[PDB]
Amino acid sequence: IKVVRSEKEIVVLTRFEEYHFDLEKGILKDFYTMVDGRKHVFTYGNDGFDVLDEGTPLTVIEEPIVTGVGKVSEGFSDEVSMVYNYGYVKKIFTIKNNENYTFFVDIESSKPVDVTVPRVSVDTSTDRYMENYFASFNPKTRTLVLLKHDEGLLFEGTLKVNGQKRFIVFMGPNKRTLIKKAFPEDYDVLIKALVNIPG
C-alpha cells in the first residue's frame, strides 16, 4: 500500500507485511511481518526468486518498473506490481491490499529458466515437497511459506518455467483461515498434509 523506492531497493509496506526487493536481480531480499511487532521472518539466501538460466543467475537489463491501480498519496491503494525485465524473461511481483500474506509471481520466458523458491526454515526437516505445493516452516518465528507451483510431485527445489506461468505465494503466520482464502480448492488436503511438519 506504501511504496518507497530507494537507490538500493524497493520497499512495499502494508499494515502487516513489509517486503524488500532489490534492483538488479529481481529477488525478494527481505520479508517482515508486523502483526506482533516487526519480525524479520525471511531473508535472502540464494532463494529469493532468482532467475537461473542454464546454471547462472540472470540480472535485469533495465531498472524495474513500479505500477498499480489506485495511486493514492502514499503509492497505491489496492494493488502494487513490480516488473523485472531480463530480456527474454519477464517477472512481475503483485501485492494486493487483501492483508492475506499472499503475493503473486507472474513469470514469462522464451527459453526455460529456473526460479529458486524461498525457504524460511533453518533446516530441511521442516520443509515439505507436496503435490503442486512447496511448504516451508520456521518454528522460531512460526512462519509458513506455501508456494503453489503446479508441478505435481515433479518439483525439485526450483521452479522450472517455460512460457507463461503464475505462482501464488503465501508467506505469513500459521493462520488457517488465511490459507483457506489463499488456496480454497486444495485447503483440505493442504492442512491435512501440513500436520506432518512439527508445527
CB of 32 to a copy of itself, least distance (A): 22
Is 87 within 8 Å of 96 (Cβ atoms)? no
CA–CA gap between residue 105 and residue 38 (Å, rounded): 24
Backbone angles phi, psi at 58, to 5 degrees: -95, 150
Q: Is 77 in the site for a copy of itself (CB under 8 A)?
A: yes
CB of 88 to a copy of itself, least distance (A): 7
Q: Which x/- pattern, by CB under 8 A, does the window 139-178 give for a copy of itself?
A: -----------------------xxx--------------
Cα distances from 112 to residues 115, 119, 142, in angstroms, run 10, 22, 34
Q: Which stretch binds a copy of itself (CB under 8 A): 40-48, 106-114, 118-126, 190-198?
A: 106-114
Q: Which stretch binds a copy of itself (CB under 8 A): 31-39, 40-48, 59-67, 93-101?
A: 93-101
Backbone angles phi, psi at 83, to 5 degrees: -100, 130
Q: In which residue are the cell numbers 502514499 written? A: 74
Q: Is 61 in the site for a copy of itself (CB under 8 A)?
A: no
Amino acid at 156: E
Q: Is 94 in the site for a copy of itself (CB under 8 A)?
A: no
Site size toward a copy of itself, by CB under 8 A: 20
Q: Is 112 in the site for a copy of itself (CB under 8 A)?
A: yes
What is the side-by-side order of every strand in the sheet holding 28-33?
A: 2-5, 10-13, 17-21, 28-33, 39-43
Q: Which stretch binds a copy of itself (CB under 8 A): 13-21, 109-117, 118-126, 187-195?
A: 109-117
What distance, in Å, lies between the first and last C-alpha atoms of the chain?
31
Binding site residues, a copy of itself, CB under 8 A: 54, 69-72, 77-78, 88, 96-98, 108, 110-112, 162-164, 181, 184
